[PDB]
Write a protein that binds this ligand. Structure first.
Ligand SMILES: O=c1ccn([C@@H]2O[C@H](COP(=O)(O)OP(=O)(O)O)[C@@H](O)[C@H]2O)c(=O)[nH]1
Length: 451
């Protein structure tokens, strides 16, 4: 009855959409996760309260995206077989007494919108990036803003009280500030907003107290309602869903344990390190990162993915045994909530950021692309909960800067500010998702409307 369509295999898009579905279920709606037959065949299903329903990207027996390395050429294949299979599913379900009351869809998949509207199924866009990045892409689609987006473009927005911070050249979203480096990602980011005004609902995974100017603008401009942070209820100290304590659809397996190692560590001492589930680091970059961690002297929990750890030398991996632990995946929210954890050296993907916020953990920001540079700027200025690594003239992260930023957040004069500010945002985040808060209300309205 409620269909959920995250960009398949995108952990950063699947996690919040599923958490949003859990809230819907709490309000009596029945959610269904819609993903590829491949992903469904390699990942155990979320479980109650979710049904599962499979579409196809063409490659039902093999990771479509390793087989089809070019970004542009994956999307076309997904769009082709997806749109076909999606429309099949709608009719099947309707002709089974289970029509779709609404399709909640990742707007990185604009063809979902088309297939649905053709069946007269209501649509709700699910934006899983911060308002501040969303509205910038938005202003480009609306041709209110001209490619390339510049710090001056951004300063106008700030002057008009739409952006709460002034974006510099390294803070504007790369995908539209330098579209040349990533032409496919550029149009995908802008396409999101084409046909959005024609959606029954627009939903953004954020909360208003976090981005008050940007969320005000997104609501008035695109009808976007904040429904986040869309994380398990437990971490929001929300007891309505007692058993909602972990994301239920991990696309990566946790081989090596870390929780018992974390127990042994002293309070507020561990650096969590992760650049997420999408980005890749080359050999030299892993070396600077790892040595920066060792030189910092702090204990650290370093997430180096299975499909990355081959780029990790034996020599460096042994050097990290003294004070660190290296794992392919960790229960990141559980880690962030742990007493031992002192800060989070993170690429600042939006879920990682919201997960740090909801646990009051200060950040060392090492962004690469997409929304991460903008998020990093917010972490550093307006939110004041951490610092961003400075890259040198060649764009290289050096081990000295890694150690410097860690010591700065953990031991510097401002260490209590970063913590205070993080705790400050933590309380507003929890408030917005608890019964009666601003995101909680938006979620209840949405559910009321389709029940
Ligand atoms: O070891 C890990 C690393 C990743 N995550 C989860 O994966 C998501 C990553 O999303 P994000 O937007 O932060 O980065 P992305 O991987 O999409 O670039 C977050 O919810 C993390 O909690 C996790 O559970 N364990």
């Amino acid at each position: 009855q409620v269909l959920l369509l995250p960009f398949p295999a995108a952990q950063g898009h699947t996690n919040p959409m599923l958490q949003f579905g859990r809230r819907l279920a709490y309000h009596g709606l029945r959610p269904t996760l819609v993903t590829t037959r491949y992903v469904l065949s390699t990942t155990p299903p979320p479980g109650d309260p979710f049904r599962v329903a499979a579409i196809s990207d063409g490659f039902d027996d093999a990771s479509g995206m390793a087989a089809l390395p070019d970004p542009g050429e994956y999307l076309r294949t997904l769009e082709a077989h997806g749109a076909r299979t999606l429309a099949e599913l709608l009719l099947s379900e309707a002709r089974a007494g289970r029509p779709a009351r609404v399709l909640v869809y990742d707007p990185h998949l604009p063809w979902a919108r088309r297939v649905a509207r053709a069946a007269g199924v209501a649509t709700a866009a699910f934006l899983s990036q911060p308002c501040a990045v969303d509205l910038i892409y938005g202003e480009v689609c609306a041709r209110r803003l001209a490619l390339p987006v510049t710090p001056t473009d951004a300063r106008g927005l700030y002057a008009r009280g739409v952006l709460g911070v002034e974006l510099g050249p390294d803070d504007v979203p790369p995908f539209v500030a330098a579209p040349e480096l990533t032409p496919a990602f550029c149009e995908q980011s802008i396409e999101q907003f084409a046909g959005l005004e024609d959606d029954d609902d627009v939903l953004v995974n954020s909360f208003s107290d976090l981005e008050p100017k940007e969320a005000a603008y997104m609501e008035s401009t695109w009808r976007a309602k904040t429904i986040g942070p869309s994380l398990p209820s437990f971490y929001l100290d929300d007891g309505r869903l007692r058993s909602n304590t972990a994301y239920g659809f991990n696309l990566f397996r946790s081989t090596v344990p870390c929780m018992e190692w974390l127990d042994k560590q002293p309070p507020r001492s561990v650096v969590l390190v992760s650049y997420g589930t999408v980005s890749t680091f080359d050999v030299a970059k892993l070396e600077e990162l790892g040595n920066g961690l060792c030189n910092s002297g702090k204990p650290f929990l370093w997430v180096v993915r299975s499909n990355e750890e081959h780029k990790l030398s034996v020599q460096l991996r042994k050097k990290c045994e003294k004070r660190g632990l290296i794992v392919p995946f960790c229960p990141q929210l559980e880690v962030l909530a742990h007493k031992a954890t002192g800060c989070f050296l993170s690429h600042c993907g939006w879920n990682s950021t919201l997960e740090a916020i909801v646990n009051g953990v200060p950040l060392v920001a090492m962004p690469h692309w997409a929304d991460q540079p903008t998020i990093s700027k917010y972490v550093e200025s307006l939110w004041g909960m951490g610092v961003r690594v400075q890259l040198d003239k060649s764009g290289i992260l050096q081990r000295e800067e890694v150690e410097r930023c860690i010591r700065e957040v953990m031991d510097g004069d401002r260490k209590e500010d970063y913590r205070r500010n993080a705790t400050r945002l933590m309380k507003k985040a929890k408030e917005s998702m608890q019964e009666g808060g601003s995101s909680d209300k938006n979620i209840a309205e949405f559910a009321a409307k389709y029940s």
